[PDB]
């Protein structure tokens, strides 16, 4: 919703002030192209783990107060399947197999999984003020033989995901070799993780302390990290409790995962602010570089010779430019790689340096920044 | 208390069925000697680990309902030490540089680390119901440099007791290296394990789910074991609770407690009965064995020669008397070890089989032993 205003504030700082330093040195044929609407517009995604049965897509539908189309609760197996649940105009759903060639879609690589896979994927989109801030992704429950490599799929979910929930239910805790697979692919990025106990109140608190303990034995002892990892506990669906005796326990921890999923849009506002920072940083250096090399070459002969000391010396040239300017070694570029890019560069048609665009990123990163950063203040 | 009954029933069983049959064919110079009163008449150990100040002995006075000597509530890490806590006609105290001594003490063997651990050893007595039943070891608390390798000891304490409490506290768990060390020490008995979660009411009942999670947490993560440990919660002393939230669960764990230690004395009276059963087997065999090398002696030369024979054919003897009597291969003694005993003995000394003293035992294990356990059965 209101983030909307952060995302347009990041392209019109980055189209006005970044991308004019960009273009005049040719910043997008050294390092990373242009930016576009695609990367500012990026909502958070969280993938949904589990095993079959637990309340994957009971869960979802509790967090949109809302049904979502082919959402079908309690499935066979075979035709379980992978959802990407994301806001829409109107409710409607996309199958995997044309969902793969959108271009303004972040599944378009996904079509290396093919056929098995995407008759297995689909976009149910449905406006909701939840899809507005986020999108989730249902995975298959883990139980014979699919179609497809279950666990790459899941594990590719994992690195382009922003939370990973594990859900398990304490009526039935039977953590498997599979989903120990699975949760063994997703190390290396235990910082997204987090653990759902669903159905807390189906067993009496005294069963709930033998599953809940279980549960946390064997997964230290599956993901081997001294970080503990935080597990919400309670019931996570419209429905009475059966239970009562831990009421004000899974309300308040109810309370802790709605606020940490409505966190994640404001941390990906801060995670894009900084790599907007980043790359103007780089353009900064990039510029730098390029007019250095403008700077010193001769005025009409020894051309080719010139630029060949420059390329030679260009590891000197970064301690000279890194002395007068006072900026860090380490956002400049790798050496090698720029000596092996500027062979292909005529030195003569690089442009002067210009002031007057380093002083508008400069100005940006003083001035414009502390106030978009109050913007996220105020989530 | 009423396990004197089952002490004296094995005891009454042993000297009058089973000792004669060892008597007779010299068992106790072969296998093992004579069972003294002091083998009978053992009462089950708890072991006590934690770390400092987690309420190691204030949970025995729980247990005792009632103070013992030398407890010494929160002392100085210096001036803490082991305390063996055992029943007594008398409230009295006994040095550990005495207890290594005493020969009708489990602790004769303490006497090889020495002087330092002594002077940190000691024995508390007082006549009470639950040491009728049970003797308890209070280590000290884990927190610089002792005078004894702390480890080994507490290592040499978790071989001979049949009960293992790893004690932590809710407040402040600080699971360290040294108490980690202390517990992989432990591994290869995990079957005596159990843990204790105490001060669980000075929590919130988020924060215990919290530190309960860690601990399981962590503990998986050491231990390594799919059996996944029994975890105690609950604050177990007198005062009144703080956090009355879970009420009904800490008095059904402390229950749960009760019922694990006041079972340990009727665990030790089955595998009492246990052991006399597999000495009366091995009795048995060992005379039919002595029986058959006197039978197949000559009348009266031949002696030396002939008891040679019998030694290297001492396999096949084996066979010959696992035929005709239907008895397992599994409770004989080892093939070489006799071999090599049997240098040292006149086989003409021996004595002949003798059916009464066999049949003295077979209706003891037939007749006797019901009842024996039926004894067991009404705890
Ligand atoms: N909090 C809950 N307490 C008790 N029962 C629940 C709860 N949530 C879901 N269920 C039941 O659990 C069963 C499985 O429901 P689902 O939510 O479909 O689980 P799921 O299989 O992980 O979801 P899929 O596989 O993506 S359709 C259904 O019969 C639900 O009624
Ligand atoms: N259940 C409990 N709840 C709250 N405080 C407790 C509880 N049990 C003990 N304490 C307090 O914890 C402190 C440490 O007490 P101790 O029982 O002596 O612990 P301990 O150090 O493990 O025992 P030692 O070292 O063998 S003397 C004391 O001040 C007690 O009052
Ligand atoms: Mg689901
Ligand atoms: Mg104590």
Known sequence: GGSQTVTGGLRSLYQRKVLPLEEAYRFHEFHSPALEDADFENKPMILLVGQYSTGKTTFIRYLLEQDFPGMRIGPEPTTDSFIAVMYGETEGSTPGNALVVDPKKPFRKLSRFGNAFLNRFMCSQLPNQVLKSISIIDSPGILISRGYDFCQVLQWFAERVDRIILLFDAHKLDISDEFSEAIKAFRGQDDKIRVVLNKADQVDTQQLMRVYGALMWSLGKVINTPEVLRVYIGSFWAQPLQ?????????????????????????????????????????????????????????????????????????????????????????????????????????????????????????????????????????
Chains 1, 2 share one sequence.
Do not use: C
């Open 243 to 379: 239970n009562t005796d831990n009421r004000r326990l899974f309300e308040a921890e109810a309370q802790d995962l709605f606020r940490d999923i409505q966190s994640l849009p404001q941390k990906a506002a801060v995670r894009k602010l900084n790599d907007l920072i980043k790359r103007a940083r780089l353009a900064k250096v990039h510029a730098y570089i390029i007019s250095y090399l403008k700077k010193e070459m001769p005025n009409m002969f020894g051309k080719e010779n010139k630029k060949r000391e420059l390329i030679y010396r260009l590891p000197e040239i970064y301690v000279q430019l890194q002395r007068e300017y006072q900026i860090s070694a380490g956002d400049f570029p790798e050496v090698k790689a720029m000596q092996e890019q500027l062979e292909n560069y005529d030195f003569t048609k690089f442009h002067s340096l210009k002031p007057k665009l380093i002083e508008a990123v400069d100005n940006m990163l003083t001035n414009k920044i502390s106030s978009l950063m109050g913007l996220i203040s105020q989530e």
